[PDB]
Amino acid sequence: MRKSVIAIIIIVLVVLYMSVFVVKEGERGITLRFGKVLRDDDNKPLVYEPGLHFKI
């Protein structure tokens, strides 16, 4: 039960590191899943404020 725990920890950490992305102050981010953009608040395109956000 020693290889499995370190393996799950390291893969979880690398998955989280891949997931996180930061939008710089001067820019704004648009997210694309497959082709389309994410829609929110009654089918309105969403733009990311310059803050840390999580992507799949």
Partner: peptide, 27 residues
Amino acid sequence: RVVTIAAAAIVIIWAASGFYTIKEAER
């Protein structure tokens, strides 16, 4: 049982090669 394995392989190939994505600007 090899025929069942072949059927599983062909249906998996059918499912995997069928999916496609098109960009937002495109239709």
